[PDB]
Design brief:
Helix content of chain C: 10-25%
Organism of A, B: Klebsiella pneumoniae
Radius of gyration of chain C: 16 Å
Keywords: efflux pump, transporter, antibiotics, antimicrobial resistance, transport protein
Distance between the termini of chain C: 28 Å
Largest interface: A-B, 11 and 18 residues
Chains A, B: RND efflux system, MexC-like protein
Shape of chain C: flat
Strand content of chain A: 25-35%
Strand content of chain C: under 5%
Shape of chain A: rod-shaped
Helix content of chain A: under 10%
Entry title: Cryo-EM structure of TMexCD1-TOprJ1
Number of strands of chain A: 2
PDB class: transport protein
Oligomer: part of a larger assembly
Number of strands of chain C: 0
Structural class of chain A: mainly beta
Order of helices and strands of chain A: EE
Radius of gyration of chain A: 13 Å
Structural class of chain C: little secondary structure
C-alpha cells in the first residue's frame, strides 16, 4: 500500500 | 460545483499510481 | 535510487544504466514498434497498447 496525502474537503465562502 | 461534500477525503498525490478500489495508506 | 524514490507522490522517477553501445538506443534491452498496419484508429491503438 502506497502512502498518499489526503485533504479533507471543507466549504468556505468565496466571491 | 458538484460531486463533493464537506468532510470528503480526497487524494492529492500518487494519482497516476493508484487504481480504483486499491488499498492505500493515508498520510 | 529506485528503492528510495519508489514511493514518489508527484509523478514518476526511474533510474536506468546507459546502453552498452552508443547510437543503438537510449538504454539497453529491447525496443519494439507496435504498428497500426490495418488502420484500426487511435482509440483502438491505445486499447491494443
Amino acid at each position: 500500500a502506497r502512502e498518499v496525502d489526503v485533504l479533507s474537503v471543507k466549504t468556505e465562502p468565496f466571491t | 460545483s458538484e460531486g463533493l461534500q464537506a468532510g470528503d477525503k480526497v487524494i492529492t498525490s500518487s494519482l497516476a499510481a493508484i487504481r480504483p478500489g486499491a488499498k492505500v495508506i493515508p498520510r | 535510487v529506485n528503492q528510495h524514490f519508489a514511493n514518489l507522490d508527484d509523478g514518476a522517477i526511474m533510474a536506468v544504466p546507459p546502453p552498452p553501445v552508443e547510437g543503438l538506443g537510449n538504454s539497453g534491452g529491447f525496443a519494439l514498434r507496435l504498428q497500426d498496419r490495418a488502420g484500426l484508429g487511435r482509440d483502438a491503438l491505445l486499447a491494443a497498447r
